[PDB]
A paper describes a structure:
[name] ([name], CYP124A1) has previously assigned activity towards methyl-branched lipids of isoprenoid origin, while CYP125 (Rv3545c, CYP125A1) and CYP142 (Rv3518c, CYP142A1) are involved in the cholesterol catabolism. Although its physiological function and, therefore, a natural substrate is not yet confirmed, there is a common pattern among all the substrates—a methyl-branched tail, tightly positioned for ω-hydroxylation in the distal site. [name] belongs to the 1,2-ethylenediamine class of anti-TB drugs, consisting of adamantane head and geranyl tail, proposed to disrupt the synthesis of the complex Mtb cell wall.
The 2mFo−DFc composite omit map unambiguously shows [name] density in two conformations, which differ only in the ethylenediamine-adamantane part. Thus, [name] catalyzes the regio- and stereo-selective hydroxylation of [name].
Residue numbers in the entry: 0 to 428
The structure:
Amino acid sequence: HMGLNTAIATRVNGTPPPEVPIADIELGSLDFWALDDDVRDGAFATLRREAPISFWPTIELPGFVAGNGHWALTKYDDVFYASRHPDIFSSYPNITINDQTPELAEYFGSMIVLDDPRHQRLRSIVSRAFTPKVVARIEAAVRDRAHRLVSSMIANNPDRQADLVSELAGPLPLQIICDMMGIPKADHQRIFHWTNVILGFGDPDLATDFDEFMQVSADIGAYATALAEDRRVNHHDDLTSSLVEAEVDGERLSSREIASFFILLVVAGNETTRNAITHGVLALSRYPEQRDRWWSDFDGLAPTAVEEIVRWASPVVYMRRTLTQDIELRGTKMAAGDKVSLWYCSANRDESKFADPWTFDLARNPNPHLGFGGGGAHFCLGANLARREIRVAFDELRRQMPDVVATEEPARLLSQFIHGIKTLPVTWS
Ligand code: HEM
Ligand SMILES: CC(C)=CCC/C(C)=C/CNCCN[C@H]1[C@@H]2C[C@H]3C[C@@H](C2)C[C@@H]1C3
Ligand SMILES: [Mg+2]
Ligand SMILES: [Mg+2]
């Protein structure tokens, strides 16, 4: 093949993975989430065909309460419908499939696990900072950090080998959200370690002891509380100050509400875009013709290329809802109180919605992917920020090291919730 000698194998674009026998699919087993993407993708293809709504037991993880199982929605239309009907598909009490507990709610009782009106009143505290016009004004900050990170990949590695995750994909979004929050630079890596554990728990490379998970949670919560108290006394133009100054229903946020909001923002900002970027580099490595067509017309294709990277990566695998009333979908009766899981990873391969879903096409248009969710009340707050982080990251790679390519298959995060890559070795000429 053309390119650098140690580059990973390319793939034939458009090739569907073989569908997987349904007896080999166990969404309730961590072993299933360790299988490679080709098997996972073929398994969701089987479900879309043979069991588009199906029930599964909740995965067991140390210290978490699995509780009741869940109805898995694997078809695009059902995920879209559920997302747009929050009066039936509630975000309370939790948006992962395990049960919420009072101990967890101290740190994880943010607006993401609330319905309107309280959800929207909370979201309005920070929403202006995430609008397209306001995010556009921090292009210079995104450029400066991305440009320096790529330059540092070159300066730090005389052998021209680097880990894309630790050296670019992780640190770029980390800096941007942490600066928006008003966190001093010296603490950004501490924040990143905490969010890595929070949304890596169950992978032995991150953490498997529930006491470590709760220590991390308490530590980031205490960090948030201390920063908030500083900003209460002396305002800065940052989101932490916005949080401590706001009122909802005439009342300031409590310390639990502040901590939960801070944690939500840094976790979501740190554990999503990095995976879009890393899966995007993996895809360019497997499909060099797509790299070439983007590099030849970077600004023209960037809108569609960023969206296709998000559809392909589906960084957030699923979100959970809870029914407030009985409902029948696709011939399956589901009861008030039942858990419902929305498989964005599967919606984003649904042949009923996408022409040629197995083709990675950076010009894809239209591209109604559900990578940021199905739309409606909880539509990703960070979507404009994420799209800009992704575009800039690839533009800086294109400009400085255009032939950057993966040299090993990724080390995959063991997670049902996040489509994570822990490490991706790359090289460039
Ligand atoms: C490629 C990157 C990202 C992806 C794929 C992604 C995906 C998602 C998804 C699927 C949801 C749930 C939507 C729903 O329930 O309908 C969500 C919500 C959210 N995301 Fe993003 N996200 C990304 C980046 C970001 C960034 C960079 C931030 C910045 C802090 C962020 C902040 C949030 C927040 C706060 C919510 C909850 C919104 C609410 O409850 O109203 N996300 N995201
Ligand atoms: C990814 C976006 C868009 C928002 C982040 C939303 C947010 C802060 C979830 C915090 N959840 C705390 C419990 N989460 C952990 C447990 C349950 C799941 C499996 C294991 C154990 C790892 C985590 C997920
Ligand atoms: Mg190295
Ligand atoms: Mg600052």
